[PDB]
Amino acid sequence: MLLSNEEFLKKLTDLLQTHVYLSQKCNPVDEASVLIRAKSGAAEKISTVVELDYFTDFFQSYAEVCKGQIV
Numbered sequence: 001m002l003l004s005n006e007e008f009l010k011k012l013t014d015l016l017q018t019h020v021y022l023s024q025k026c027n028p029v030d031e032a033s034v035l036i037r038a039k040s041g042a043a044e045k046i047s048t049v050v051e052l053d054y055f056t057d058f059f060q061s062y063a064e065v066c067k068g069q070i071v
Helices: 005-017 052-070
Strands: 023-029 033-039 045-051
Touching (some): 005 033, 005 045, 005 052
Antiparallel strands (some): 023 033
């Protein structure tokens, strides 16, 4: 189900921990903000809605989980 940003990043970690790939879809939502979907290999999909005002912050945290899992 639709997760909060902080939970999406938490579950993203644990998707990459249990893994290579990451695929992501983004569609815009009408209240203006964006729906992000992520899926890694065998795992289910995960979802969150990121508000325009929180884009910088969210993508800054998103980078963290990404580069954190690589090392």
